[PDB]
Design a protein around this ligand. Structure first.
Ligand SMILES: NC(=O)c1ccc[n+]([C@@H]2O[C@H](COP(=O)([O-])OP(=O)(O)OC[C@H]3O[C@@H](n4cnc5c(N)ncnc54)[C@H](O)[C@@H]3O)[C@@H](O)[C@H]2O)c1
Ligand SMILES: NC(=O)c1ccc[n+]([C@@H]2O[C@H](COP(=O)([O-])OP(=O)(O)OC[C@H]3O[C@@H](n4cnc5c(N)ncnc54)[C@H](O)[C@@H]3O)[C@@H](O)[C@H]2O)c1
Ligand SMILES: O=c1ccn([C@@H]2O[C@H](COP(=O)(O)OP(=O)(O)O)[C@@H](O)[C@H]2O)c(=O)[nH]1
Ligand SMILES: O=c1ccn([C@@H]2O[C@H](COP(=O)(O)OP(=O)(O)O)[C@@H](O)[C@H]2O)c(=O)[nH]1
Ligand code: NA
Ligand code: NA
Ligand code: NA
Ligand code: NA
Lengths: 340, 339
């Protein structure tokens, strides 16, 4: 399949390192039923977590990961909950006392977030603030947030909200509460992504819709990305912004063309539809030449400075009441260049 | 297919009646990306709505229905929102001024709601209260809520929450704000349901897991149930609790056996796993012999009395903070017999 062809096959996957990090821990995964969250759940079981707390606001998604892990039902707890509900979230943290939170709950679709920028701010920034604050207050030892190459020099509301989340979480890290963020690019076959869209077009004998002939993304298999996230969490001392080596860029036109060749469906045309608001032709390359090496060739540490939380909390209040969210986000993230 | 065999094929589908009800309306669908919500969206387009406002808190589900309807993109607005967010929901209603709300946003899984009863109360009862209140304040003309046979003499948290939602919405109905609730049974192949589960077990060479050899449900195709919901909505004058004729009961063991037969995997076993907390062996038959007929053989009107809204609002405030949710629900719904 094209998945196999575009897998990274990282040479530095380290099962025993992840087992050492997770064995007998109580771990809470937010967004547990999502593409990334579900794989985080599966790997928590694989690598020996004692008790997995699965938090998701989407009932089908929660149902499905809980069903997927039914052989391990005695050590998993499905919590149907939005992380915006601080009071209920606090009760969950007190009840189960997780030692690690893996935070994979967010809205990620660039077009939808352009159309719903207030909801993007509330779900992404306020949700992350509530979950991180509750974690620190309830003495969770370590907190790892999933981030995106879209957070790097963002051109869209979504990516900018994720950058604010990096700033907030990293600024909360201290010697009692270790936070790390891990940035990576596209996961092959993820919810609502290009590969399932192309599959559904080819099945239904429809032309493939390509945004631009030159567009490029970086790709990894979900199991590869998630295990590297966990390796990064395992080595983190707190305050690190990690970045993954995604390998070679893939032109989406070559992706489309290969899917057609593999489906034996060269009868179909590829139609160009146009670059959408907020959308990059080439996402940013994640690893900077001055980033720090780790013991894993696929994982580097990027520079980040803490911001003052009094300032950032005030800006996060402003985001909730302001007339112009794009303008308000630019106050927090000076590198934001909104592609309207 | 198993779906074809169990379809109701109601003889009283009426496309022109639904078109007359929906043509050139601004319609908002809550839960727009869900199994029922998505079909409501599709039918709103089919039957001539001017503008469809799609509200859903699940990004993939919203993404998917918006994509499914991409040929109609100029007439649809995807709103990524929980109906619990009153301030933002009010802004949406004030902006788009829908004349009809079709309310299909809820949590429905009986086991998950037994395990998360506070979330079932908040999402189902408070969400419905927020949406219904906002609708009435923003002069929405008509409000139609999807309900369930699980709401009838409920034995589980989920179904009891739905019954409270009926009582609330129907009690809000008045001369200017017409409410209808429509009860029906299982939709064939809905999200997270038995047919997809059995398909996945067969595909992975696994025994089918059957709750109880005698268990039965009533079934309809989603397009059938939704079109009948819309016919009921069209005829509603306000205050009606409608029920659909689901046809004959289906034993889930027969469903399981037919799926094995249809897949030529009679090699697979059917394992009995047991009745779950809150679960009924036979759901209630929806049509009572004293229900009123309508012009559609498939739609009847059940008796319902309004409750005092001051009392019910107080009870709903308590449900949000109480430790004894099962007991508290029993005070609101005296017919609740929690299994
Ligand atoms: N999919 C990718 O290619 C990719 C790549 C790199 C980074 N990421 C990042 O990973 C994160 C998740 O991506 P995904 O692909 O898993 O998306 P997803 O939508 O499949 O998963 C997110 C999950 O979080 C849940 N959720 C959302 N908001 C919530 C809330 N308030 N409370 C509780 N649960 C909530 C959702 O229901 C869903 O199950 C995003 O921030 C995204 O930018 C994704
Ligand atoms: N067999 C059936 O599926 C069936 C039969 C009869 C009645 N019903 C009733 O119909 C309703 C929906 O069932 P379904 O099968 O479509 O379930 P579903 O989970 O597929 O759809 C519900 C949709 O509502 C959304 N949603 C949930 N809470 C929300 C919130 N607070 N704000 C915004 N969006 C929200 C979800 O994301 C989802 O897309 C439930 O009350 C159910 O009991 C279902
Ligand atoms: O119908 C589509 C959907 C996506 N893409 C492109 O494929 C890549 C991956 O898009 P996806 O939605 O999968 O994720 P994103 O990169 O926005 O997170 C991007 O370059 C898109 O422009 C495309 O050509 N056609
Ligand atoms: O793995 C399963 C799942 C469901 N059921 C039964 O199938 C029927 C339909 O269950 P579903 O989850 O589809 O919907 P529900 O009736 O709970 O809304 C009920 O009698 C369930 O007990 C079953 O026997 N095995
Ligand atoms: Na999966
Ligand atoms: Na469990
Ligand atoms: Na007709
Ligand atoms: Na569908």
């Amino acid at each position: 399949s094209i998945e196999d062809l575009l897998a990274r096959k990282p040479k530095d996957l380290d099962d025993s390192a992840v087992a050492a990090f997770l064995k007998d821990k109580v771990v809470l995964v937010s967004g547990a039923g999502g593409t990334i969250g579900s794989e985080l759940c599966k790997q928590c079981i694989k690598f020996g977590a004692k008790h997995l707390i699965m938090v998701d606001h989407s009932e089908y998604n929660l149902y499905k990961i809980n069903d997927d892990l039914n052989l391990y039902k005695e050590k998993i707890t499905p919590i149907l909950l939005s992380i915006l509900d601080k009071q209920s979230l606090d009760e969950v943290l007190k009840t189960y006392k997780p030692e690690l939170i893996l935070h994979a709950a967010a809205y990620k679709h660039v077009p939808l977030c352009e159309q719903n920028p207030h909801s993007a701010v509330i779900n992404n920034i306020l949700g992350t603030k509530i979950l991180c604050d509750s974690a620190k207050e309830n003495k969770v030892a370590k907190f790892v947030m999933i981030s995106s190459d879209k957070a790097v020099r963002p051109t869209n509301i979504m990516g900018c909200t994720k950058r604010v989340c990096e700033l907030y979480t990293l600024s909360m890290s201290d010697e009692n509460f270790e936070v790390a963020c891990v940035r990576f690019g596209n996961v092959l076959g993820s919810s609502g992504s290009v590969i399932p869209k192309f599959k559904a077009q080819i099945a239904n004998n429809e032309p493939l819709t390509l945004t631009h002939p030159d567009i490029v993304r970086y790709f990894m298999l979900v199991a590869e990305a998630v295990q590297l996230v966990l390796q990064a969490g395992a080595i983190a001392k707190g305050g690190e912004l990690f970045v993954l080596d995604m390998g070679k860029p893939v032109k989406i036109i070559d992706l489309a063309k290969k899917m057609l060749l593999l489906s034996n469906r060269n009868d179909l045309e590829i139609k160009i539809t146009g670059l959408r608001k907020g959308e990059k032709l080439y996402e940013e390359l994640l690893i900077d030449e001055n980033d720090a090496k780790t013991q894993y060739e696929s994982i580097f540490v990027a520079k980040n400075e803490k911001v003052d939380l009094d300032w950032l909390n005030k800006e996060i209040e402003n985001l909730q009441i302001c007339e112009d969210i794009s303008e308000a986000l630019l106050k927090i993230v000076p590198e934001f260049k909104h592609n309207k």
